[PDB]
């Protein structure tokens with residue numbers, strides 16, 4: 517019972533301690549490509565890089581680099597590509613990835629501007645009649661429809677490979693109410709957002725892995741994938757109470773560094789899993 521464990525940590529207020537043990541035991545792998553001088557401008561943060569072994573490679577002989585990682589959860593039967601919010605110069609690369617990896621959905625957990633500064637580039641068109649064209653990767657992106665709700669907006673986008681004139685519908689799931697500081701008060705809306713993504717089919721195996729990002733693509737994005745996998749496991753296993761969130765998180769960190777950036781996010785993840793389990797279950 518993780519809800520029982522949850523209350524213990526809370527009782528003895530030891531979230532920092534537990535979160536810190538996870539950090540200590542977290543995997544550490546080479547990030548050689550990420551650090552090559554030529555890729556300096558392809559990284560938003562100096563301390564956030566994809567491990568070489570799990571990085572997404574762009575299909576181009578020029579420079580195949582993009583700060584993104586493939587998180588592959590074998591037992592859960594789910595995969596996710598966690599990436600940083602694209603930069604002014606990596607938007608074409610961002611959509612190239614979405615096309616090459618055959619992704620059906622893009623999940624955004626932040627706003628273009630937060631705490632007064634840019635956390636992500638405006639990488640999608642905001643008006644139907646103003647399509648965007650990425651000359652470097654030869655891609656055309658068109659806003660098809662938009663549905664603004666209280667805590668999130670879902671957009672329908674048409675992505676076209678100008679080289680082949682092939683097209684695909686991409687669903688943009690944008691969680692718009694994540695606080696500038698700290699974590700959400702209640703996992704309620706965050707969970708419904710996740711379920712809406714599940715419902716679209718974007719997380720299903722018939723499609724490439726969903727692309728997820730916040731600013732660095734490790735904190736909020738971490739919370740999203742950790743909660744989704746844990747719920748899914750509790751759904752699969754003969755004994756749902758055997759799902760250990762701390763171990764699942766560590767398995768994920770084998771594919772990308774720093775998933776879950778604070779003890780607050782860790783507690784929030786527990787909170788979301790526990791709440792989502794109560795609904796999904798009974």
Ligand SMILES: COC(=O)c1c(O)cccc1OCCCCNC(=O)[C@H](Cc1ccc(OC(C(=O)O)C(=O)O)cc1)NC(=O)OC(C)(C)C
Nearest residue numbers: 539561562563626730731732733734735736773774776777
């Ligand atoms: C806590 O650290 C870790 O867990 C960790 C680890 O265990 C092992 C390896 C790396 C690790 O983590 C690496 C990052 C440690 C803390 N670094 C920072 O805050 C920033 C980059 C950053 C920005 C926003 C964010 O998240 C937001 C978002 O995207 O909006 C969100 O989730 O809300 C996450 C990371 N770097 C920075 O200022 O440059 C410097 C510090 C160089 C000046």
